[PDB]
RNA sequence: UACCCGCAGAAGAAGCACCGGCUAACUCCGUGCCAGCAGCCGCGGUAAUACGGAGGGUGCAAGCGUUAAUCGGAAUUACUGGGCGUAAAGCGCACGCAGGCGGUUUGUUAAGUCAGAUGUGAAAUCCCCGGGCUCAACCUGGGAACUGCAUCUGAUACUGGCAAGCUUGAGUCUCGUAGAGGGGGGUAGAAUUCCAGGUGUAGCGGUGAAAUGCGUAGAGAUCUGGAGGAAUACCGGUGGCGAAGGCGGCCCCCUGGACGAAGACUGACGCUCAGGUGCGAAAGCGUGGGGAGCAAACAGGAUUAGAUACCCUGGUAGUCCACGCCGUAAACGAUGUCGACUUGGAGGUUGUGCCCUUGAGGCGUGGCUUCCGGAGCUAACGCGUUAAGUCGACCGCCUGGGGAGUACGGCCGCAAGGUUAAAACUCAAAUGAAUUGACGGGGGCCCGCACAAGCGGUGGAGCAUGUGGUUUAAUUCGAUGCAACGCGAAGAACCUUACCUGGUCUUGACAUCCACGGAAGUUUUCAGAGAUGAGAAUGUGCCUUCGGGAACCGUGAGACAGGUGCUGCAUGGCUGUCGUCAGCUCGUGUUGUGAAAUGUUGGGUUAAGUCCCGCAACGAGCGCAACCCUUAUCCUUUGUUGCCAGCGGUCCGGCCGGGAACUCAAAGGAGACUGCCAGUGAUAAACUGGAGGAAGGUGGGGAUGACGUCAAGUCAUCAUGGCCCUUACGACCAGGGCUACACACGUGCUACAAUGGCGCAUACAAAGAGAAGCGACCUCGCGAGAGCAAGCGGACCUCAUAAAGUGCGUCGUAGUCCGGAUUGGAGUCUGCAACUCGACUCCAUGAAGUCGGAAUCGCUAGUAAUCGUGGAUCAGAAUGCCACGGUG
RNA sequence: ACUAUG
RNA sequence: CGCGGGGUGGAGCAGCUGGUAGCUCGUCGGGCUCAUAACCCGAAGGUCGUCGGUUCAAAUCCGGCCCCCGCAACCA
């Protein structure tokens, strides 16, 4: 069967939204659009930065992204310096004048999208998929999660059929709406076209 | 299944199309045999 | 000539097989189940470590490979060293001659056996220690070996011989007991059939249901008497006897074996048995009898697509007796005979000896037999003192599957045929036990609008819409049992658009990079269907260590762009499906050679692998459940744009003072948990009922879809590996097409009418939407609409009068005052444009249709049925889709 | 009263 | 040749006494089935060999022509 989306299903219980902005129907459509270009952009340049999120939101007129991601130091560069030439060109993109933040993630190991990352990066450098995996488990459960799983998709180890091994450990409980599931995703760009990446990473409950 | 298969099967075209002379004839004439006394001993029916 | 010395210069001298596994050695390109490879498995159908070539590597190396041949591996002919219950394999059972084997004791002999000695066992070869060719092969000295045969001399435990014994193996006698043991002869009763009568009248018989059949010429039913043949109810029993085949009423005559008790007797007289002889179910054959019932063949009737069958009605050989043959069976315990040893329990049958027989009993001892099960054995299943355990003696038999127990020959037979018993050729398997599944016209328990009980439809008619086909220049592409067909498409006039026709472009409609020129923009211009091609004007945003750079446009050549092109069978992502079904697994332990099992099953119970109790399992995870949204009662807070109970006033309007009660609004809390009472139940889990409660046993509805299944769907949303196109398969335009129509199917809507149609009045909703928008009031128009124009980003204004309902009138069972298809005329609106092809209005026209063959769908309650309302998509275009309340 | 095949 | 019989939907048959074309199978369309066969429902289809006469009217009565069978073709 297919599995509801386990952010979506969760959003306003235990998940927050990520754009967090009030709008009329007038106006919609275009803050969607800048939203996603505001994303589209801050993807392509940070890659090498382990981004976790992008938050965004609207007070006023202005747009305010936060960025969560394991390494501050990359995006901040010197003095700024690179947070600085962000915002104005981003505050091109929206249009409006603009305002960078950053979080720190402290255990990139327990974030979906960045262990989704790390394993999809091993994957481009011809890695043995079942270590990459495997790896990654073993590290959630030393930093305690509660449990986790991953699940690697089609032509692995350049196969000629398509498989989807995956590996959990652990409690991973998906029918719990309080359960606090991070989920995330992520395809890696192979000569053997594409192998996707799913992670869920229970963390407890409420 | 759900198979490759490689059948085969014919086609073929073909078009349509739409008395003896005497002379080339020789007519041996003769007695015959057997049963019906001074009739069948005389007279020369078989060709 | 060997052998030795001198000269010149790395000079004159490396290939063959292999690289998928077995087996040491891997990657590209070509090829596309073709060509080919191959010892065996197998490789090859567009990413081939298996073909062919290349590069690299492995192995041998003056050789390397292929073929043939022998042994090996092969314990696969097994002396060393195999088997025979089910894998191939125990003669159908006995008797028994040659043959093999033989209890115990003393003597003797010295054949076997053992020890020693001599003779011989040609030399070479082999093996050991040496020697000689530069080494090695090669040659050679000495030895060992030649496992053998003969002769002689000893040994005498074992085997054998000869002699003499013994009593335990084997037999004979005495006395009893049980027995469907065999052969011959009588006889009893029950039943079927027929025959001859009496009573009697319309059916009988048969089957799933029938018919054929018998019957008014008197059947079937019933009673009396008679004939004849065959078999022996009850007893009757995992009871008994027999070598096996087999043996069943009672009585007599002839007769075989077994067993038991105590004693006497012979003294190894024994065990096994190729060839040989006998016995040997049923069918079948011969000669002669018999013939009730049954019953191959055969006949008719059914059933059936057919029915040469199963079922029915008949019925001949045969079945029965006598005397001959045949010699076979899943003749089976699928287990040759004889003997010895090796823990137990429960029975049955038949003897026998001891015991207040004191009881149908207590204590022993033989024989045969049934079921459990231990050690051990076995591939396992199982066998298990009656072995398939531990041994010994003799015999029979097996050596891959088919061909084939067949052919030929021999022997036997009256015949049918039996017995003995091949090979060519062909395959890489065939086979046994056990394991997990799936399946069963196997069984058990349980569920579900699955059936049943009901209500309403589809299938027929006309329309709408999708699909197939056909047509076409094109009818773009996809979706195809359930799980495609009002599906992608939440809306094709142009656009959309992917298709066709014709007209155009070639670094391009779209993006980046460099070069050079111009601020961007504005404004009319004549051609042309349009894309497109030929003209007037205009600033200069901006900083300038002043070059121009940046905003933006055209021109220029190449890196490139582009592709709704192919592959969903190379992929990701997303979805359908079994199925909201209760399942699916793991770890550690344990059982088993192992696949696997257990847990997860069993006893209860639940909607539920839900919960309890048990139990070599103990635990864990994904699922179930809960946590979420909505609805059903109440409380608290908060009252405008919502509300109006109690107050005053009124244009009778919550409309205006005011009110904060009530409805309602949306935040926060309470409430339902088998919590309480009774009974049922293994004191358990739970169940049945009751109370209070707005709600009661998951209160109703949604969201939530385990591991997996179908190479399910989608490369045409997007992404993407590979292949492909690159003056075209890319790109721009106008017109056409996706709307075609002999047909077939799907899903809908409207009908066929009085529970109704038309006309006039009149009541009660909910939920939504709205700024390039919803649009009141008033005015014009029969109407669709038009003109003017407040309000409203909206609990305020607008869309917007809900309709079924109700009351009053009217129609009278008619293709109608039912039905509205179709066509003509005239309009309205949106839109550059309604010809192809929009919707709506008015006047006229008034098809089919009178409740739908076989078949088939939905639904368990605010449900079905029926009635309207709104929304997304959208300029316009809803009978579809999503949502809302009414009645019910 | 049912039935065959892939 | 002499005598007699027969040509009927695609197949085998009935109708031949002038005014009326049936039966079983096959074909076509719909169902059932995962699909096919069986089974269930619905619909079509015949110049009556051929030519000519007779009649108001011909599958039918009558003649010629063509094909197809059967019987006869003997006594010397």
């Known amino acids: 069967g297919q599995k509801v989306h386990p952010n979506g299903i969760?959003?306003?219980?235990?998940?927050?939204?990520?754009?967090?902005?009030?709008?009329?129907?007038?106006?919609?459509?275009?803050?969607?659009?800048?939203?996603?270009?505001?994303?589209?952009y801050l993807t392509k340049e940070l890659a090498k930065a382990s981004?976790?999120?992008?938050?965004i939101e609207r007070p006023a007129k202005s747009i305010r992204v936060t960025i969560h991601t394991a390494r501050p130091g990359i995006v901040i560069g010197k003095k700024?310096?690179?947070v600085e030439k962000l915002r104005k060109v981003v505050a091109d993109i929206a249009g409006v004048p603009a305002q960078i933040n950053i979080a720190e993630v402290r255990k990139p190991e327990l974030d979906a999208k960045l262990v989704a990352d790390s394993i999809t990066s091993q994957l481009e450098r011809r890695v043995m998929f079942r270590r990459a995996m495997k790896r990654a488990v073993?590290?959630?459960?030393?930093?305690?999660?509660?449990?986790?799983?991953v699940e690697?998709?089609?032509?692995?180890g350049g196969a000629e059929i398509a498989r989807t091994e995956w590996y959990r450990e652990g409690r991973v409980p998906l029918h719990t709406l309080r359960?606090?599931?991070?989920?995330?995703?992520?395809?890696?760009?192979?000569?053997?076209?594409?192998?996707?990446?799913?992670?869920?990473?229970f963390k407890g409950e409420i | 299944g759900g198979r490759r298969h490689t059948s085969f099967s014919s086609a073929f075209v073909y078009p349509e199309v739409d008395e003896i002379?005497?002379?080339?004839?020789?007519?041996?004439?003769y007695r015959?045999?057997?049963?019906?006394?001074?009739?069948?001993?005389?007279?020369?029916?078989?060709?």
């Open chain 2, 21 to 29: 002379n005497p002379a080339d004839l020789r007519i041996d004439v």
């Open chain 1, 80 to 82: 700024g310096e690179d």
């Open chain 1, 51 to 55: 981004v976790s999120r992008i938050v």
């Open chain 1, 179 to 201: 359960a606090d599931i991070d989920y995330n995703t992520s395809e890696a760009h192979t000569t053997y076209g594409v192998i996707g990446v799913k992670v869920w990473i």
């Open chain 1, 10 to 40: 969760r959003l306003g219980i235990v998940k927050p939204w990520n754009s967090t902005w009030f709008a009329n129907t007038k106006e919609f459509a275009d803050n969607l659009d800048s939203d996603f270009k505001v994303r589209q």
């Open chain 2, 32 to 47: 015959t045999s057997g049963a019906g006394g001074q009739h069948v001993n005389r007279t020369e029916s078989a060709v």
């Open chain 1, 138 to 149: 073993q590290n959630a459960m030393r930093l305690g999660a509660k449990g986790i799983k």
């Open chain 1, 152 to 156: 690697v998709s089609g032509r692995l």
